[PDB]
Amino acid sequence: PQLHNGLDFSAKVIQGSLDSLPQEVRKFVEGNAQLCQPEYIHICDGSEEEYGRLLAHMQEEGVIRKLKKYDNCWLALTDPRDVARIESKTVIITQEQRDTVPIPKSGQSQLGRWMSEEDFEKAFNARFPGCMKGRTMYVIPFSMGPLGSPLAKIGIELTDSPYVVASMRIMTRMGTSVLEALGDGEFIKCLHSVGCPLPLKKPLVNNWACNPELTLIAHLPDRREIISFGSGYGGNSLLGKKCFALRIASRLAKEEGWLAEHMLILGITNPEGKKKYLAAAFPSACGKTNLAMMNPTLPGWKVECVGDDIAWMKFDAQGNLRAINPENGFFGVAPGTSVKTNPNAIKTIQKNTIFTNVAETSDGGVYWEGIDEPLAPGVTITSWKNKEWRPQDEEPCAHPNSRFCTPASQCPIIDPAWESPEGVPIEGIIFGGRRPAGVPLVYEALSWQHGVFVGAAMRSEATAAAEHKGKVIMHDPFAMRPFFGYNFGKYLAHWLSMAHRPAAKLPKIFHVNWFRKDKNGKFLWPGFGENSRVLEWMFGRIEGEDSAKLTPIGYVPKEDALNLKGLGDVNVEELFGISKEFWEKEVEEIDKYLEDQVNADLPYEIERELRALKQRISQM
């Protein structure tokens, strides 16, 4: 079948067989092996023996360090330039720009970066040829969602980073059994490279292979391809997560009639023995993980975690909105995690966990801002910059977007239906973001269409999860601004169309704000475990309790309708204060944003809600 072989990479396979691969999978492996020119090919089997060799490899290359204080925990330190997502270098390629983003009326679009095929071809050909020279190409077969389940989606990620392989083993279901389930079926093509071919032209920082200058994360939904170059950080390199399960999947969901959202899924049980499931979309670094693992302070209440970041939802034959968590672990923000804020996370991350960019203690432990644990005398701290660090410096010991990567099955409060292929029934959806002023603690939408408008109007302070600085209040509708895989106007019409479904049991929609501050600049709400008091009110509202009061922005709890026992000091007046002056400016900014950014793709029912809210505020 060949004249000089040349295209047969069988001699370079150090684990597995190209013969054992399905036809379309081998073509994908061999085609990119010809282009990237790796020295070795490793077909992953997901075994414990393989994971051990990958760790020892990384440890011999100075990529990770063993945290001897815990059981099978490891620390990785990255280049300070490769620490988070880069929204400005995350592009979607479609034939028509209108399929990716609405055509803005004035400025440029904030709802996604579109790039033509012709432009991406030039960018691709300038990066990937020979990019894996001297390195191993790992072939990761992985499933998003329970293996063998009909709703699960399968991908193949090619990467030259063992750090990516080890993280994908935690965050997805990967190995030989996925190739057996895939067969000749369709799979999502994922290609990743750190962009540092050997021999090294440039010296690496902290032994972290990356190419910041050429970083590009590209999505080709028409070709079911994800192509990532230059970055090793999880959001850019774990292509099953944000790239697949949110950006690519949101477009497939639009085409197939389901939903892919940036949401946690939890189950909450009340003292009367009743349990309901809730989903919550908060922007990055705005509280999803802490809410989904919450230890409630109300007696008789129990929270269980289905997932903390991504939800795939679909109406069943009975009209229930059912959700699954397609992920296999948690990729959570480390700073702020303590026994008092998220004790269930502390119990989880003590074994089989990979930490990135946190501080190391001299006795083999971890440290970060907000850990709230004193160290023993003589224990010294090494910062994420691999330097000596004292508590009286200015640099934090851990990067603000440092992460743990831990298996979901180790969480003490993991929900017993978290791997159920039928999903869990959602009865409530929660929106919310970081708003230091104006936005009350919690309110309830007036209808399904008003609730969609509430999601579309979400604003929040910038965080360390992306490249945004200044804590400026940005728009982040549905917490999905960095993750839309298609036109945001069509996304809104997709959400609105669910109210047309026959026998659809539409959940209630709430909006919360844990982050409101007083005149002094400190938080008015204790949050974390105390957020169970807000969830209690939502639970009763779903049951139909008459505990709400009508306001121009929606329903708020009645007086003495929230359980505030054990606090008392809470300035309830400022937690639910609705200033006409604040909200007149808020609707103006929402109006200017929706008019410019969504333009002719803005559904009329969203504009009608904007006009209705503007009228109710003027009547105050």
Ligand SMILES: Nc1nc2c(ncn2[C@@H]2O[C@H](COP(=O)(O)OP(=O)(O)OP(=O)(O)O)[C@@H](O)[C@H]2O)c(=O)[nH]1
């Ligand atoms: N004041 C206050 N801070 C909170 C609360 N919940 C979480 N935080 C802090 O906000 C930061 C982000 O919390 P996470 O739960 O990790 O945010 P996330 O939504 O899961 O973010 P991603 O994983 O990037 O999607 C953490 O450092 C927490 O300490 C809260 O209820 N009140």
Ligand SMILES: O=C([O-])C(=O)[O-]
């Ligand atoms: O990493 C995440 O979950 C993010 O950036 O939202």
Ligand SMILES: [Mn+2]
């Ligand atoms: Mn997230």
Ligand SMILES: [Mn+2]
């Ligand atoms: Mn999280």
Ligand SMILES: [Mn+2]
């Ligand atoms: Mn309608």
